[PDB]
Amino acid sequence: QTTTVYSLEDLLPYLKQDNVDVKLAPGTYNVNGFDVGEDRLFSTTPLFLFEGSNSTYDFTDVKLNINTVVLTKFGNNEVNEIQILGNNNVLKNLKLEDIGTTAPSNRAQSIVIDGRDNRIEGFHLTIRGSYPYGYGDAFGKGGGSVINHRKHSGVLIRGLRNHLKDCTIISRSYGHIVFMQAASYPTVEGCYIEGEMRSTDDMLAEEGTGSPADKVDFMTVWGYKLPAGYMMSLQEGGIAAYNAGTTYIDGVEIQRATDNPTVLNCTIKNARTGVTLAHANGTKYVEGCTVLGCENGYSIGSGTVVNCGADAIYGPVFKNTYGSDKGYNADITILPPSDAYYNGHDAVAYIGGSNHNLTFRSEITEIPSNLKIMVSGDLQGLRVLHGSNPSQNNFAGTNIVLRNLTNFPVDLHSDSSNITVTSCDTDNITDNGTNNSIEAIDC
């Protein structure tokens, strides 16, 4: 029943059909600029548009090389390499690599998952080609940028009950690695997700070169000159959910927030955030995850983070996003450093909002003097200085259980109230709050 094809040309008609079982034969397939045009292999974008439903596509031992010049061959329009519009499809085992670093004319996504009940499993994706590449989001990630951007993100999960499973996603592009827009019940499971980092000090060393950042005197979109002493991802979110998107399911165009996301047994390295789901609605659940060398570890707003780890070399392992955060329950291990420390945020965690139950565990004995668990206060976060992003900083925390099974110090700010703290040591706890309880635990 499986049909095997031996070229991209013979693959494309099956994408339009329902209930097919198709295999693209092992080999290397190249997509170049000359493959785009009216009489060419790819006359439209998305390049591979999966419109059928109830189909299975096997890409075992397939290497698909897409030249990044293709991101410029469709005018000033978004280019998606793969988009799934149908339902109940399974795509497996493709190795997809962007060749070169040519930026999109507008913007690009490697994979977009619409429809419902689709699964992409076992893919190996390498994302390349974006502008500007080397500043993270310092000079703009949305409208009103200081340096105008041509972003290129990895996997965009939308639709309903769509599933990214056992994939490796490597990004060397300015964009999210895995993100969700208008996705209901998305699941990310068993994935390895990886960006790369650059220090703000290395960016500031562009002074006098005539670089794009040098020409704006390093004035960030946050309203201040780029501060020294931070490590930034060149990517955006590793696994990030946003509240405003459009998706299509069964011909219906839907504009909604992401809801009910689940993230299981993923490892996320060198992204702006490990897992951020604060903007998603419904039930948020994160379990078994490992976050290494990200600017922020876990920020889900409300829900459960359990049996998860993060190191603190570049930023806090935990952050409450807003003072509106309620019901965030977490059990997070602060992992040994994956690399040298370079944490300009002066915090291992920033806690606020209300009715949280937070446990931190760690075997670390070598504690950098600037790292502390903060409950309320003025976070020295890269994007929240000098009143920038004001709702994400300087807010109160009330009625929170904090179980500090670590050697990290704790600072309870004046805006903290009714914090129930238990800690291995109470001598390194500063309490300036109201009606807080501090009790010692024996290891």
Residues 100, 130: contact at Cβ < 8 Å? no
For residue 183, count CB atoms less than 10 angstroms from its CB and return exposed for 0-12, middle for 13-18, buried for 19 or more. Answer: buried
Nearest to 86 by CA among 112, 110, 107: 112
**Cα distance between residue 47 and residue 69, in whole Å:** 13
Cβ neighbours of 360 (radius 10 Å): 22
The helix, strand and coil proportions of the chain, stated in percent and rounded to the nearest 5, come to 5, 40, 50
SS3 401: strand
Solved with: X-ray
User: 202 φ, ψ to 5°?
Assistant: -65, -35
**Cα distance between residue 158 and residue 366, in whole Å:** 42
**Cα distance between residue 47 and residue 92, in whole Å:** 17
The dihedral built from the CA positions of residue 375, 377, 381 and 387, taken in this order, carries a sign that is positive
Residues 252, 238: contact at Cβ < 8 Å? no
**Cα distance between residue 42 and residue 9, in whole Å:** 9
**Cα distance between residue 175 and residue 164, in whole Å:** 18
Chain breaks in the chain (C to N over 2.5 A) after: none
Residues 139, 145: contact at Cβ < 8 Å? yes
**Cα distance between residue 224 and residue 69, in whole Å:** 35
Residues 433, 376: contact at Cβ < 8 Å? yes
Strand partners, 62: 27
**Cα distance between residue 393 and residue 387, in whole Å:** 8
**Cα distance between residue 254 and residue 114, in whole Å:** 11
Residues 171, 127: contact at Cβ < 8 Å? yes
**Cα distance between residue 348 and residue 313, in whole Å:** 9
SS3 40: coil
Q: Which two tokens stand for residue 64?
A: 């698909």
Resolution in angstroms comes to 1.7
Strand spans (E) along 317-368 = 318-319, 328-334, 349-351, 353-354, 357-361
SS3 340: coil
Residues 243, 267: contact at Cβ < 8 Å? no
Q: Which two tokens stand for residue 382?
A: 């890269």
Helix and strand tally (H, E) in the chain?
3, 41
Cβ neighbours of 43 (radius 10 Å): 11
Using DSSP bridges, classify how beta strands 90-92 and 56-58 pair: parallel, antiparallel or unpaired. Answer: parallel
Q: Which two tokens stand for residue 46?
A: 């998305």
